[PDB]
Structure formats: structure tokens, C-alpha cells
């Protein structure tokens, strides 16, 4: 034996970052280089929740001035802080 090795809907949290990176790089090549959007990662899970809690104190992250589906989740709590 040497173990069949998982596929791309079983592995996550390492493969999630890899695939997010792959999806991103594919998108920028398919656009032309005008769809630039740095960091297919950031933050973590628990550290991200702590940052989200701190946004209610009055701080912002970097996409507002007063993983990439984090923007949709984050807007919902950011608009609460504002």
C-alpha cells in the first residue's frame, strides 16, 4: 500500500488556500492583469473573529476607511460597527 490520496472536495484548510490561490491566478490570467486583488489568504479563523470583534470598538480592517468570501461575511458586521 501507499494510500489513494484525497481529492479536491475532501481536503481543506491547506487545499482551500491552494485552490483559492489557483482560482485567483486563473482569474487574473483570464482577465489580462487588471483584476488584481492581493492575498488569497488572511486571516485565520479565531484571529479573524477577534479582528471582527475589534471592528465593533471602532477600527476598520483594510477594505474600509472611515479566503475571499470573507468580504461578504465581513460587510454584515462592519456595517453594524459603523
Amino acid at each position: 500500500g501507499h494510500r489513494e490520496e484525497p481529492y479536491l472536495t475532501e481536503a481543506g484548510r491547506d487545499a482551500f488556500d491552494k485552490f483559492c490561490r489557483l482560482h485567483q491566478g486563473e482569474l487574473q490570467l483570464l482577465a489580462g492583469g487588471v483584476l488584481q486583488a492581493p492575498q488569497p489568504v488572511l486571516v485565520k479563523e479565531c484571529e479573524l473573529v477577534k479582528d471582527v470583534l475589534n471592528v465593533l470598538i471602532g477600527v476598520v480592517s483594510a477594505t474600509f476607511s472611515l479566503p475571499e468570501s470573507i468580504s461578504s461575511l465581513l460587510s454584515e458586521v462592519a456595517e453594524y460597527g459603523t
Partner: protein
Amino acid sequence: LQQSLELKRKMLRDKQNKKNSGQHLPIFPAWVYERPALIGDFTALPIGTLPLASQESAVVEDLLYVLVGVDGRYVSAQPLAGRQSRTFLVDPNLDLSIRE
């Protein structure tokens, strides 16, 4: 600080004139008003680059001293001695979420 001592003497003359039998009204000595140590409010690391859960403990310890007037570890009472005015200057760099 120095300016209150005028007011005391100006009023002392008026109340001495107001009664004709109260002669030589008393006052408290000058050093009870003058001394800044008889009132409540009279090496160092850059705290901003530190981790969060150490900064929190350091700032609560300093601010707790600042509540009773005595100067903290990173908050200096600016020498605006005298009247009912006072200012304080806090350490410039800290993590923003604590700082607000």
C-alpha cells in the same frame, strides 16, 4: 496657583470692614495652598510594538494609578499647575484598538 492669593486678601479687607467687632479674622498658612504634593495629582519602553495581551495588562495598571491622580508609567501630568484646569499627555504609540 499664585493668582488665588490675591482674591483672599481682597475679600479679607471687605469682611473686616463689614463687622465692627470681628477684629483680625484668621487665615490658613501659605504653604498649604502652595505645595503641589499635598494635593492628589502631582526606564520606559515603547509599548506600541508589544503583543496585545501584554499591552492590555500594562495599560490597565498605569491607568488605575492615573485615576487617583498619581502619574502613571506612560502618562505625564503636564505642568499646568493651579486653577481648575489640568491636562495629561499619553504615550504616542500603542495598538489602535486599545488606544481608542
